[PDB]
């Protein structure tokens, strides 16, 4: 139809603006149309939004500045536009530093109609901007972690029994630390006298294995070299060679009993190192030698003790569990509680969006409250919003609403003098549903108004409110279930008629794709394309991105269906089906997105864009023309035996009001097909030249009128044996033949909903008082031999009908005898004078119609006489009403009707 598939515009396939979605945006001040496309961020293109223009027969895309910049992985971009501006939201991950959770919501920016910034909004910490009393109108990854190193002495002064106690204390401390801490590992070395490396924090991932490794230690014992142990810890344990985190909190735990002796390194040397510009150190010096000698000062130098928090002097290993709690208190991390209720952390606000007006937007929140869903009604200037959801009345229905995904799709229904927000919940009760915000008092909640019927079909994932006649009030709502299953994932669109009195929904129609495609995903994308067909009625495009998937040689797949809106609703069948194969090679998922209603090619007619996964396709709309034909027969009445030239003055005229078709029939060609005497088996008229009534490709170019001069001749002598008393009907069958190639301007297309033929009739002057019609009266005077009887006394029931014609002339008159099938004719008698033909049909089970072919144009003012002798066909019937009706039908221009009835009564039940 309108869409000019032969000349599309494509963005380059190199994926510079790798297209996820595409829409057309117009500024209603300068009438400037753009081709905003959304892309996933990469190294080449970081921007989420680009603006594309048709320059020099090519789509050139430029990034739109002042929009939020995605970071890292692609998480989701939504862009919606209205006459109030363009709204773009990106899903942003924010990780809480002191928590094992994460926030996943949207950072939105509102642009003006000229793509200039208006407002910015991030919905992290949503409870701050959540004022619930604002009445709704409704028209009324680096890891910080923690790393702990334990230095366990194993000198010869320690007996083997004490080694077991120290090992058990170390294991218990590690277990309690793992209980209270999560993102924090352990490592240790054996401070026995030979510097050996035990399991490091690389092996600390497997906690159970680390416990066994700790339990598998053995004390050798050479000499207490504390400084060497610290230096080895610095060189191996805390170095990133085995995965140590650079910014991890480093805690040193030293439990020693013997002072430094035979140590080449100095204790004061290893502590004053440049790498120790902030490191936690602890010294739990069990031993009476510390209390009784100078080596207490050695203990103090081991670990800094500003408040004596690190210094832990104990008398024996039996109190290790006694001071384990104190040791845990100042080292453990108290990381944020994990398992808190999911209210707004993963609400994903801005998943779907809708601009309500200049300052207000409607943002979907799929993940709020355990993925129950919702919608944020946000005012961008006051920076305050309120949350709308199902508002369950208990704890059973709060859990029953979870994972319903409300706010997956959000739309607005426009009414006489009020608005109505709607939201889709594509897995509500596993079918999907459409919720509508119904206000009462000051609390507004989404209640279900429509539901799906198939499990997993995703009913309500796509919402398309359609206002057909553009009066400001939506007439239809299109709801898609794109994964509807018959044999594969076919797709289904539900058309709902909005009631004008209250706003209720009635299922008008169910739409489907072309048969023979088990995988289509019909309805995955739908949009109101404005007016494409130039009839001032909104039309709809529905994409099926999976049609033809799995084709050989990597063929393009996907389809778009165009539905023209009529005064009674949408079309029964799509006017157009644009397959990706006929657009361009290598188009994957053609039909993922669509938008239209604005002129981007400069021709003045609004055209569309279709987004594939990776590219955006732009199609221009063709002008629509409707022609008006007219004959001007010169004789205007064929005389008796004319045998003369009949002059024809065909004159095609452009009846369309689509201005002047710009380079339209300037290049397209009209194609006539004159069908003289259509319907008659033996035509009594034919064209003088047989080459001007089979196909005639004439060039129109300039001018709104194309006139011709044809000629009609009789056929092979034109004997009047046929029905000369009937108008000869001639059918003009025009057609449009577009050229081949890339035309600079779109070529016109005939209107699909106007029939392209112009049947005209020239009348034979019927020989009568008025030589344009012969009307005669068919009077009948049938006589009944006997009115009725029963029980074999009927014998041969007899009837007699005599048809009398005494008017001007009777032409192909008809008979009609209506008698019940309870009686049957043994013999039938024809009217002798004259031998008038009568094609009597067989009896019928229903009310009898003996449409006998009496009359014929030859019929003079004579009369007929038909004799009928009936007998019951082994049937007995009681008294009835309306008796037997006989009708005479004349097929002239003026119809004369004759009616006759008999009397029937027998007195025998």
């Amino acid at each position: 139809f309108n869409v000019d598939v032969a000349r599309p515009w494509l963005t380059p396939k190199g994926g510079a603006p790798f297209v996820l979605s595409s829409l057309l945006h117009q500024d209603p001040s300068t009438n400037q149309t753009w081709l905003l496309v959304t892309s996933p961020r990469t190294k080449r293109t970081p921007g989420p939004l680009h603006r594309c223009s048709l320059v020099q027969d090519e789509i050139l895309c430029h990034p739109v500045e002042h929009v939020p910049i995605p970071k890292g992985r692609h998480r989701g971009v939504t862009v919606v536009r209205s006459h109030h501006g363009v709204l773009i939201c990106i899903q942003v991950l924010v990780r809480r530093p002191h928590s094992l959770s994460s926030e996943l919501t949207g950072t939105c920016s509102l642009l003006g109609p000229d793509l200039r910034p208006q407002a910015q909004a991030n919905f992290f910490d949503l409870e701050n901007l959540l004022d619930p009393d604002a009445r709704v109108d409704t028209g009324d990854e680096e890891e910080a972690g923690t790393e702990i190193a334990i230095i366990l002495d194993g000198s010869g002064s320690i007996d083997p029994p004490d080694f077991q106690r120290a090992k058990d204390f170390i294991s218990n401390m590690m277990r309690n630390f793992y209980e209270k801490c999560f993102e924090c590992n352990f490592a240790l070395v054996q401070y026995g006298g030979v510097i050996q490396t035990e399991f490091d924090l690389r092996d600390s991932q497997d906690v159970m294995a680390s416990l066994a490794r700790v339990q598998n230690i053995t004390q050798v014992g050479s000499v207490t070299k504390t400084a060497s142990a610290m230096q080895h810890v610095l060189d191996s344990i805390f170095t990133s060679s085995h995965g140590s985190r650079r910014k991890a909190s480093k805690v040193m735990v030293v439990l020693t009993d013997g002072g430094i002796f035979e140590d080449p390194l100095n204790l004061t040397t290893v502590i004053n190192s440049p790498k120790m510009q902030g490191v936690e150190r602890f010294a739990i010096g069990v031993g009476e030698e510390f209390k009784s000698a100078r080596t207490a000062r050695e203990l103090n130098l081991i670990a800094s003790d500003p408040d004596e928090t690190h210094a832990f002097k104990v008398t024996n290993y039996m109190a290790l569990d006694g001071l384990l709690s104190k040791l845990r208190y100042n080292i453990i991390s108290m990381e944020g509680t994990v398992g808190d209720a999911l209210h707004y952390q993963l609400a994903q606000i801005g998943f779907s969006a809708q601009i309500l007006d200049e300052r207000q937007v409607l943002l979907g929140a799929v993940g709020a409250f355990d993925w129950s869903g919702g919608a944020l009604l946000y005012d961008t200037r006051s920076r305050r919003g309120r949350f709308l959801n199902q508002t369950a009345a208990a704890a059973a229905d709060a859990e029953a609403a979870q994972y319903s995904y409300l706010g997956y799709a959000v739309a607005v229904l426009h009414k006489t003098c009020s608005l109505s927000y709607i939201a889709g919940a594509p897995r509500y009760k596993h079918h999907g549903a459409v919720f509508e915000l119904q206000k009462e008092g000051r609390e507004a909640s989404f209640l279900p108004v429509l539901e799906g019927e198939q499990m997993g079909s995703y009913f309500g994932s796509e919402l398309c409110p359609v206002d057909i006649d553009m009066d400001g009030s939506t007439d239809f709502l299109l709801v898609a279930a794109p994964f509807y299953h018959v044999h594969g994932e076919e797709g289904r669109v539900y058309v709902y008629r909005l009631s004008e009195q209250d706003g209720s929904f009635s299922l008008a129609r169910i739409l489907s794709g072309h048969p023979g495609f088990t995988n289509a995903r019909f309805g995955f994308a739908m949009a109101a394309m404005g007016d494409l067909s130039q009839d001032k009625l909104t039309d709809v495009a529905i994409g099926a991105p999976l049609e033809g998937f799995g084709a050989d040689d990597g063929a393009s797949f996907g389809s778009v269906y165009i539905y023209n809106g009529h005064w009674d609703g949408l079309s029964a069948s799509p006017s157009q089906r644009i397959r990706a194969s006929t657009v361009a090679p290598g188009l994957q998922y053609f039909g993922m997105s669509m938008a239209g209603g604005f002129d981007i090619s400069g021709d003045g007619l609004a055209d569309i864009t279709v987004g594939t996964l990776g590219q955006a396709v732009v199609f221009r709309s063709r002008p629509v023309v409707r022609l008006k034909v007219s004959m001007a027969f010169t004789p205007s009445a064929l005389p008796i035996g004319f045998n003369g030239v009949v002059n024809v003055r065909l004159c095609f005229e452009i009846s369309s009001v689509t201005t002047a078709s710009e380079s339209g029939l300037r290049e397209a060609l009209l194609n006539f097909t004159l069908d003289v005497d259509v319907g008659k088996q033996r035509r009594r008229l034919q064209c003088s030249d047989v080459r001007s009534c089979l196909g005639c490709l004439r060039e129109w170019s300039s001018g709104s009128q194309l006139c011709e001069d044809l000629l009609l001749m009789p056929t092979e002598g034109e004997l009047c044996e046929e029905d000369c008393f009937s108008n000869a009907s001639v059918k003009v069958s025009y057609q449009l033949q577009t050229p081949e190639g890339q035309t600079d301007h779109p070529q016109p297309i005939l209107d699909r909903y106007t029939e392209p033929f112009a049947i005209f009739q020239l009348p034979y002057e019927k020989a009568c008082k008025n030589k344009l019609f012969c009307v005669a009266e068919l009077q009948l005077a049938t006589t009944v031999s006997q009115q009725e009887l029963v029980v074999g006394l009927t014998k041969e029931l007899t009837l007699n009908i005599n048809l009398t014609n005494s008017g001007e002339d009777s032409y192909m008159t008809s008979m009609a005898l209506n008698y019940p099938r309870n009686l049957q004719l043994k013999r039938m008698q024809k009217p002798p004078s004259p031998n008038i033909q009568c094609d009597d049909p067989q009896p019928v089970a229903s009310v009898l119609i003996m449409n006998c072919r009496i009359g014929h144009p030859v019929l003079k003012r004579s009369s007929a006489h038909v004799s009928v002798v009936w007998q019951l066909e082994e049937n007995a019937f009681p008294n009835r009403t309306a008796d037997i009706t006989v009708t005479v039908t004349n097929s002239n221009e003026r119809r004369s009707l004759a009616n006759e009835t008999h009397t029937l009564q027998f007195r025998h039940g």
């Binding site: 994990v338 897995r427 299953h485």
Partner: protein, 510 residues
């Protein structure tokens, strides 16, 4: 019923009851050569004998029909007979196909165990790592060649499905003192094998895992098990897929929440380690996609789910033919009896389905599966029988109906659901007529140039007539109809130039 037609081909295409006659110019008694298309009696009584009329009737010929044999020991069991038939049907005529199905005993079965590992299945895994020997022994009672495999799934490893915190990605468990593995989407752990020791060892090597949201990515695992035939190890025997979970599943539109726009492409994506590593690049499969893949692979899913998840999988099994749903215990302690009950309820049922009918062709079934005389009603899209016993042979009556014509011999592929056995129907349409009466430029019909091209002799363009003898005498004179009754009394119908009667009365006198 039947009306006068120009030629034999159009006459037979008009109605199945037409009985076009081909006698050598016996219409040389004042009759137009276009009224030889009526029923059998009106053409047998009117001139031509049994030899000189051709009423074409379609037929079916069996190409290969091997007998229903129960292999040797579950080895070469043939269950569907016949296996290739050629059906030629005249438009408008029924064609009855007799399809027999035998439930051979000891038919081999492959059972792939596809487990959920979302930390609510810790005790379930503890039981399953020992239940392998019991499962193999119990399944060996109904069949002799049984092979079992193991797989697992958690979810797609992106937000909001699993917590992608690096510390919570290595250890997705609430506490660090217990052993568990990082979340994955589908890990093919064990290929279908006949020894239970490998099952025990491989499943015991596995650990529990965890994710963030309640629904799981089990559809990805189901699709990858159905598609990756070489890696799973499926054979051409009955295939069971035991799907055990205690929560719902993600469907095709759910991946958009994680920024996943690419539809699942229906290709095998298992790497060398058995992992479905590129699962974050495709969305979840849909119910329709999963059902199509399962039907195309002849795999019968068994959903062993808990009581809280039962209705969802009941709906899903209503959407999937040849599926079973059982109620799983909180620790999978009843999974073997559940599997046995599901397998018995699946084997007791026999279904016959058609691949795809060509335009204008209709199919109907008559499930005669108890008693050689008792058959149920017609007009169904499936040859369904339940409670079929071992060694019992069922019968299906498949009726084929073509309306206009079929240009190409489209192959029909009737098959029994859950079995690789197939019945190929070569569907030709007998809508061309060969009465053999046609002779090129026959001297007997017409004059000089021109050929009959049909049973009726085609008039030569040089002159009009039966043999071009009379251009207008035979064509124009209507006295031949006016001869049509006396003494017929209505019990006999009129004949052109005569009155035809029946019931011991005949001829114009009748």
């Amino acid at each position: 019923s039947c009306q006068p037609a120009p030629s034999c081909q159009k006459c037979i295409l008009s109605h199945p009851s037409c009985a076009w006659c081909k006698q050598l110019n016996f219409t040389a008694s004042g009759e137009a050569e276009a009224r030889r298309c009526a029923r059998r009696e009106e053409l047998l009584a009117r001139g031509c004998p049994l030899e000189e009329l051709e009423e074409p009737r379609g037929q079916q010929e069996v190409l290969q029909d091997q007998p229903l044999s129960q292999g040797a020991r579950g080895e070469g069991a043939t269950q569907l007979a016949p296996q290739r038939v050629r059906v030629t049907l005249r438009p408008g005529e029924p064609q009855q196909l007799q399809v027999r199905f035998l439930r051979a005993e000891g038919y081999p079965v492959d059972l792939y165990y596809l487990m959920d590992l979302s930390y609510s299945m810790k005790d379930d895994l503890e039981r399953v790592r020992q239940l392998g020997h019991a499962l193999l022994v119990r399944l060996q009672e109904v069949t002799h060649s049984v092979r079992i495999g193991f797989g697992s799934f958690v979810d797609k490893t992106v937000l909001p499905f699993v917590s992608t915190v690096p510390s919570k990605l290595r250890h997705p468990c609430p506490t660090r003192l217990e052993r568990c593995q990082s979340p994955f989407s589908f890990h093919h752990v064990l290929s279908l094998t006949g020894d239970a020791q490998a099952f025990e060892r491989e499943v015991g090597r596995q650990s529990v895992s965890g994710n963030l949201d309640s629904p799981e990515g089990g559809f990805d695992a189901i699709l990858q098990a159905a598609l990756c035939q070489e890696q799973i190890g499926w054979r051409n025997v009955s295939r069971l897929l035991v799907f055990t979970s205690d929560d719902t599943f993600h469907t095709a539109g759910d991946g958009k929440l994680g920024g996943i726009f690419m539809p699942s492409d229906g290709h095998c994506h298992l790497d060398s380690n058995g992992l479905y590593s590129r699962s974050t690049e495709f969305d979840y499969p849909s119910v329709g996609q999963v059902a199509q893949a399962l039907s195309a692979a002849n795999i019968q899913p068994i959903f062993a789910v808990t009581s809280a998840a039962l209705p969802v999988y009941q709906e899903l099994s209503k959407l999937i033919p040849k599926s079973a749903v059982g109620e799983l215990s909180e620790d999978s302690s009843n999974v073997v009896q559940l599997i046995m009950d599901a397998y018995n309820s699946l084997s007791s049922t026999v279904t016959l389905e058609h691949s795809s009918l060509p335009p204008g062709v209709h199919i109907s079934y008559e499930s005669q599966c108890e008693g050689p005389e008792k058959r149920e009603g017609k007009a169904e899209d499936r040859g369904q029988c339940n409670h079929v016993r071992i060694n019992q042979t069922v019968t299906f009556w498949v009726s084929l109906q073509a309306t206009h014509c079929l240009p190409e011999p489209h192959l029909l592929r009737l098959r029994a659901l859950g079995f690789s056995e197939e019945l190929i129907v070569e569907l030709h349409t007998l809508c061309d007529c060969n009465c053999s009466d046609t002779q090129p430029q026959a001297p007997h019909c017409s004059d000089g140039q021109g050929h009959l091209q049909c049973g009726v002799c085609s008039c030569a363009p040089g002159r009009l007539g039966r043999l071009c003898e009379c251009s207008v005498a035979e064509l124009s004179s209507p006295d031949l109809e006016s001869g049509c009754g006396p003494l017929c009394s209505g019990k006999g119908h009129c004949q052109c130039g005569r009155c035809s009667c029946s019931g011991q009365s005949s001829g114009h006198l009748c």
